[PDB]
Amino acid sequence: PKRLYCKNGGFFLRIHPDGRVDGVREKSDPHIKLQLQAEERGVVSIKGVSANRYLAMKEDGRLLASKSVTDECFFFERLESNNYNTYRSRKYTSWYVALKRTGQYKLGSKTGPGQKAILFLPMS
Numbered sequence: 001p002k003r004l005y006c007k008n009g010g011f012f013l014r015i016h017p018d019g020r021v022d023g024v025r026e027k028s029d030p031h032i033k034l035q036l037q038a039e040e041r042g043v044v045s046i047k048g049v050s051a052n053r054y055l056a057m058k059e060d061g062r063l064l065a066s067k068s069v070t071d072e073c074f075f076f077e078r079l080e081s082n083n084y085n086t087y088r089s090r091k092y093t094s095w096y097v098a099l100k101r102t103g104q105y106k107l108g109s110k111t112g113p114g115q116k117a118i119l120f121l122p123m124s
C-alpha cells in the first residue's frame with residue numbers, strides 16, 4: 001500500500017468513501033492510502049484502502065471511485081524518470097490520471113505525456 005503524491009502542487013491522491021476523488025495535503029489522511037494490484041506486468045487497478053473503492057476514469061475524463069471493478073478501473077503504470085509514476089487509462093488510452101495545482105483532479109481529456117500533473121511519486 002502507499003500514497004501517491006502529485007508533483008503538481010504536492011497533493012496526495014485521495015479516494016473518499018462516497019466515490020469522490022481529490023488531492024490533499026494532509027499527509028496523515030486515512031483516505032490517501034491506496035492499494036495497487038497488478039493484472040499482469042504494467043496493468044494495475046488502484047484501490048482506496050479505507051473507502052474500499054477503486055479509482056475509475058469515465059468517458060468524459062472525469063475521475064471517480066467505484067465499489068466494483070469495471071473496464072474503467074485499470075491503468076497502465078509506467079515508471080518515469082527520477083521515480084515518478086504515471087497512470088494512463090487502459091480504456092481511454094491517451095488519458096492519464098492527474099491533479100491540477102489547485103488540488104482538484106484534472107479531466108483525463110486535458111492531460112498529456114509531458115504534463116507535471118500526471119506525475120506521482122509513490123510513498124509507502
Ligand SMILES: O=C(O)C1=C[C@H](O)[C@@H](OS(=O)(=O)O)[C@H](O[C@H]2[C@H](O)[C@@H](NS(=O)(=O)O)[C@@H](O[C@H]3[C@H](O)[C@@H](OS(=O)(=O)O)[C@H](O[C@H]4[C@H](O)[C@@H](NS(=O)(=O)O)[C@@H](O[C@H]5[C@H](O)[C@@H](OS(=O)(=O)O)[C@H](O[C@H]6[C@H](O)[C@@H](NS(=O)(=O)O)[C@@H](O)O[C@@H]6COS(=O)(=O)O)O[C@H]5C(=O)O)O[C@@H]4COS(=O)(=O)O)O[C@H]3C(=O)O)O[C@@H]2COS(=O)(=O)O)O1
Nearest residue numbers: 007008009081082099100101102106110114115116117118
Ligand atoms: O485550460 C487549458 O487547457 C489550458 C491549457 C494551456 O496550457 C493554458 O491555456 S492558455 O490560454 O493560457 O495558453 C492554460 O494552462 C493552465 C493549465 O491548464 C493548468 N494546469 S493544471 O494541471 O490544472 O495545474 C495550470 O498549469 C500549471 C501546472 O503546474 C502545470 O500544468 S501541466 O499541464 O504541466 O501540469 C504547468 O507547470 C509548468 C510550470 O509552471 C513551468 N514553470 S516556469 O516557472 O514557468 O518555467 C514549467 O515548469 C518546468 C520548468 O520550466 C522547468 O525549468 S527547466 O528550464 O526546464 O529546467 C523545471 O524543470 C525541472 C524538472 O521538473 C525537474 N525534474 S525532477 O527532478 O525529475 O523532478 C528538475 O530536472 O529540475 C528542473 C528545473 O526546475 S527549477 O525551476 O526548480 O530549477 O520545472 C518544470 C516543471 O514542470 O516544474 O512548465 C510546467 C509545465 O510545462 S508547460 O505546460 O508550461 O509547457 O503550468 C502551470 C502554470 O503555468 O501555472 O495553469 C495553466 C495556466 O492557466 S491560467 O493561469 O492562465 O489560467 O490552460
